[PDB]
């Protein structure tokens, strides 16, 4: 009775999408094939025929490899042969070469999939779009997608995974103009866009899990685990569930400043723990240390507004409430003077799973914080600042605007950049 | 699949299948695995895509025919049984 | 004869209703079909008050089972007694609710009241005689803040002279488990105070507490502290079937309690609550029944009744007892905790005993009491919304419905009227 | 017991069939190719 | 002794009167071929009322099947219940029917009445004091309508005294299987406020909710909605064939429910419509078949009663009841709901009691109530016809098989005046 | 009892007429031998005296090729040896050639054999023809034909399954002189004209029944469903069953304005069926959709009339009526003012039988949607326009005069379709 259509957008989120609808599979218990050797399996999938459970999802990509390599796989006999559409020519990391050229040519064969999803659908909780922050097939789609499905669908909360610009290490050297404009589409048409850097994951995967050299593929595997969580309660069972209704209520603090942050805490490396077990007592403490934040920026350099603390395991009711104390008396996690409470809890039943070959252990317990800290502010700022640097001397400018984008478009952007900035600055400001 | 009704299942093309006559008789090598994967495969005259796949018979039902645990007015109506209070063994 | 149904309204009250009819049922004879196994004749003679008779002998729960997600009687259905309610009060929402008292009860509220009533009614016309009614919500969040209070608003026109009973889990000062708590309660409080008459206000905080310092369970989950809860639910009704000495109801309750309409804000405890490692010397006495009532450890409420006089004790005794020795520690708790109980009115307690004791237990009783420190909850939670009000934090997901600035500016301003003369008479 | 009659309760998405303007085979399929002249 | 013609001519009635037939067939223990083989001679005693007789014992049903397309005569033959009706009575015509007012009441429809009229003969004369008619038909097609307004036509001229108890499944919103109903309505009610005592209006649009929301299934066919159908057909003539305290024949349930001569259109209705699930949880008494009785989920037509003040009511309540309840749970709802009772009749209710409970339902009933509520069904028909006539539609083919403008605008104004009447006392 | 005349005419009729009959054959247990190894059969197979099942149909082209191939072809040991009507010469794309010249020459052979048919079995409900308006024996003959049979026999309803021109798709330069000389007779003796397109199908066949190579024999199976679902609510029982001659009075309102669409929904191959739960719901959301069409004509330009949903299988009528309320409510499918309603509904009892070794899935439902819009208007002023470019100075005309033709009715026949372009044109407004 409860949905979630997924959009997996762009290279990135097909690819973060291969890695979660594998742990959605084995959550539930279809082979890779669909084919199940209960309502859990409904939010992500349906069932059709003789067992044929095929997953809620429409792969899109404007370039026709990444999808390619899902219709050529093992995942080949799960996902519609239809819900899987690619296209021609790429968009060359050119926000304008998808929202305004080529992307404008495949919106109708993805936005009539979803009217078909839903229509089988009989309870769309909120969509599920996977984008990154980088390029054109995740910034301007996910943007134009974006617009129409917000007033073609509706009020349903449209939330969104998106991989944001690193500080330092990034695979581009036009990614600070794409980011900006992707969220002048965004910051108006979505409701909670989960946020993640790669540069962090890749020090969660260094510091804790002991995992050097990790690939694209185990840096996705933990974003599954955070989304799973999310959408873990809407699936099996629990004490304390949050509908993905509630994700919203209990965190957007103000009619923007919707960017939660995301911190699986018990992350714990494959061969290491043989005489312990976290406690929801030190995994909580876990999920706040300044170094387990997946998306970079000094927690501390801010004020944590609000906080959704959703534990997966054999967490009791009780034992959350001793956590939240102590963290609420820790100095330095500093909540903001209007909001007096601060805490949401999650207690799921379901134990994180194991992908069959993977980094992450068995842990009976879990801690997928979704924080909103004034602390994001600066972790775009620099963003903002490299957008600075280049557009100054009108540099690659020249390929934006010969693809249908008015070079005023950029300032505009900026404009409500720097808007995000005074807002995130102002809700902090504490009251006179 | 294969126990989806006990006539065999709709195998996909493989190098026995192959034909001389039609356009995907194909030079070279010719082992199971590219007529079993779609960017070799090509079109013939007025055929279905090569499956790739491992599909039922012919006779196959598709789709989801739900059979409810029903009988409906007559059995709403047409008789009145109340619980049944079972004699337990005497413990 | 006597009739009271009840109203499972909310995560929370719908799961502290699988606890009422596993306490209930348990203590005269209904089995998990439904099927009468028990010893004693003196507890079929007033299955009419919470239980309906069908063809063949099986009693069915008089209970509505009211939610907007059909995630949580999906549960209590699952759980042992969920085949005992009837398939067709186990009504529901399909649309979610966000735990937003604004969309709980005016706009996706506003789909499932004119089905509730349908199935309040056709139950509560059915009887002989009406008392009054049931309802455990939560006070602090969606479904059972926002659809809650609906509820006691419709169902008071309809009946407007029944005992209208509701249950709640005020949200705790330290433990906080929804953000928009604050913003919750205030709205529901405010329709509380007028078409409500007995309301007893428990907490998660103390029921905690009494879980680790009189129960020594180091395991307490959601289903052990909704048992304590259900105690004083039994309780309170016990006087209403079981037979006995000096009576009373609950309409009795209210005039020997409330002493000004307003003041309806009760507090509850069970007084025989024990560590499960006792085994040995069994004799409880009266003397030492009356000691772990009137103590600041067994209230199930946040606030502590030291910070404030009483209004009126209400102990509904229960089990074989001489009243002479329970009217004299009546009054020795009076004398002896002086400033602690009210100078103007005489008499602060009312005294009422059952004969027949909760199964096991040979002897117990339940708390009523209302102190009138319970203004410091009332006064917190406005710190809690003055702070959160003023610069509109959460508003700008409760105003999109349609509710405006107004109807937050007149609840806190009846809050701080709730506030005023709970403690104008503090000051006697 | 007092009875009175009631009923017809007002309980008990998707944009279009139509709109979506569909496109056609050279978008996600195969072009079949175009042809000039010799000169 | 008191007998009743039956007619199944139309595509609809030609199924619900077979349906019918299996739901007479077993009361009086006719089996599928036609020897009797119940147990009780209370059954016997009247196997002259519905049914005839023959050499052995084979006691045919006394019906007459008509439909100008030979479909539904095999489809019925080889049914459920076939061979017992007689090889003669399946007057057929090998035509087109085809959806249309002028196709079975003026054109090829007209071709077969004689010989249809010609078979309804041979039985009236047969048989002793005849009583009624009974016509299954569908006020929205051709034969339904056409057909239907012509036997009854040409059969309240041949036997004016005789009452007249046809069943249509008048038009609606939601459910549409015909483009051109609203005419076909229309102009069918023209004949049939002039021509008929007894027109039970049954829809589908609420039949399909009752075995949607009432009797829960989840694959509701077109043989469901017929029994449901026909259970309130075998309901209004019970007390014609078994004992009762207190009975009521066809020409009582006319004197007693049609208040004024042109106010005669009435919505049927069953009582034991309860889903097997909750079949156990609630009981079957008197007081409980009367909720089940009085509301709108149990009325097999729309239009809700509550928007139109009832004029009058019967309930042939069946099986073995106490008249002392019948009489105050009948009293009760009555000035429980004098709003929505009418006034200028003291009294508004009729109970008849049959001895003879429906196979199984040891107590059931059958609801029969003319109510000021109809107005909307005979007024949603009344605009369709008006979009489908101020750009004259399908009147190409109507205007071509014999009809006339002026026949539309006849039927119409005929048509309002019924809402007009049945609103000239709703406003009392 | 039952009877449907199917007569098939020209180059496109004949090749429909094959395969059409291969799902009739195949429906029940007739070999194409002829030889049956009960009361279904008589509507299109004629019973003999040994057990044989003469079909009841005429095939009639001036063509020898297309006839001969029946003649040698496997479908042979069951027609009759002389309904195999062959000309001697061709009509060669010429309205001239079959109805005023060789075509009158045919006549009197091939309406022998037709009033032979008649007299041999009761009950006729109607009359089905088979052609194009491309440019010969289906325009021509076609012609002299249903405006003589609407005399000869009387009244009974006239049904054509013609080939209208794409505004496109073209295998003749004169189409648009052949199509429009069709239709002044066509207009005024035919009841329902179901026009079927041919890039449409293309289309159709490449997106859903997937073939990037489709061939003629492809293009008939479909339309051969077509025209085996209208006749099977009178060839099987059913719940909702619609005759012959009463969807006639239930989808032309006006006289003039008479020409319907058509489409079927279970047109979806083997790798989708699996993954796909054609179930009531979206089966009936398929025929509304633009892509489903039949014939290319935008469905959403111009609003739609009447709507004649031939159910076909194990439909559950609740199912269908509530999925029919929520075809209503939703806003692109704009309905007539002056029909409140518009949905003809019915229920066969027998499941598609598709041919074995075929493309299509073998589905237990179908919906033939015929349905009747004011967007075909639009579809003939594309015709209609190429008459006024090879007009302006009369091309391809000495043709048409040279065997024999007045220059009178090509202005006559524009006034027809400036009739029929005003008549599908005024039942669009509304009054107030
Ligand atoms: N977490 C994660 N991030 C990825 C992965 N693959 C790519 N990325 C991110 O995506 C950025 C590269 O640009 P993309 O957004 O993937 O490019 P795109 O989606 O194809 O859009 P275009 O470049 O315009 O075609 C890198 O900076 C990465 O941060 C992945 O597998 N996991
Ligand atoms: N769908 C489909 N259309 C066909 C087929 N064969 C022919 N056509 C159509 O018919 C047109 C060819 O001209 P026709 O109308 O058949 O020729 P004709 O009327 O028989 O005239 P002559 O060939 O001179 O006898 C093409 O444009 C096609 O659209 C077929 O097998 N399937
Ligand atoms: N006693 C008890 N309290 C609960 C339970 N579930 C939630 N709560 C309390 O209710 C508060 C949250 O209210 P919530 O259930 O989310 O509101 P609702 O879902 O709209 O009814 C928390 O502070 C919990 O302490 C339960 O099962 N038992
Ligand atoms: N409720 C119900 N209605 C039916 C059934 N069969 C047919 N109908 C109705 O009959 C109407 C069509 O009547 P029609 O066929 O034109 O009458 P005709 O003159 O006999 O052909 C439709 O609106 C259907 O709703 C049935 O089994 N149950
Ligand atoms: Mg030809």
Known sequence: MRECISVHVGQAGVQIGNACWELYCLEHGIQPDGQMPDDSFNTFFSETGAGKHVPRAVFVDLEPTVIDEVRTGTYRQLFHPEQLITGKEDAANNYARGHYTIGKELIDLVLDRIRKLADQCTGLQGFLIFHSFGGGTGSGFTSLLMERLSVDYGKKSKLEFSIYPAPQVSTAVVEPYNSILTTHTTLEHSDCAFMVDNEAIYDICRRNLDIERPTYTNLNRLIGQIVSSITASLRFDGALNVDLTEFQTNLVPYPRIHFPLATYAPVISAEKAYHEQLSVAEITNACFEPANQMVKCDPRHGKYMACCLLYRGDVVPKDVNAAIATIKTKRTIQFVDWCPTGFKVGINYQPPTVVPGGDLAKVQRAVCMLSNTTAIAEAWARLDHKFDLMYAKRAFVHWYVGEGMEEGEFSEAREDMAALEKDYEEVGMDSV | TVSQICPPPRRPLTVADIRPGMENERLGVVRDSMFQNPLIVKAELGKPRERSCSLPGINFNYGLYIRGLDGGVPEAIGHWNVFKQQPTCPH | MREIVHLQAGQCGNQIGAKFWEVISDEHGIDPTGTYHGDSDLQLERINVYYNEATGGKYVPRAVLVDLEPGTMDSVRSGPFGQIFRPDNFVFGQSGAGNNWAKGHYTEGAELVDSVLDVVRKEAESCDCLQGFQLTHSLGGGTGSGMGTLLISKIREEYPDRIMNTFSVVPSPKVSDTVVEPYNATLSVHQLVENTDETYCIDNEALYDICFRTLKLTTPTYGDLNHLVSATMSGVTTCLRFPGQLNADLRKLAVNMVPFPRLHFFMPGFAPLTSRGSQQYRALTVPELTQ?????????????????????????????????????????????????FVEWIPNNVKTAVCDIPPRGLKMSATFIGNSTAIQELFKRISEQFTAMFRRKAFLHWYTGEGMDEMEFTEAESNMNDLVSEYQQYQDA | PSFSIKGRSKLGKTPGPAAYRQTDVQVTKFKAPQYTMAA
Do not use: I, W
């Open chain 3, 292 to 340: 772990q009532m009137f103590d600041a450890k067994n209230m199930m409420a946040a606030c502590d009744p030291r910070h404030g006089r009483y209004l009126t004790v209400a102990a509904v005794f229960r089990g074989r007892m001489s009243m002479k020795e329970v009217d004299e520690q009546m009054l020795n708790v009076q004398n002896k905790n002086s400033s602690y």
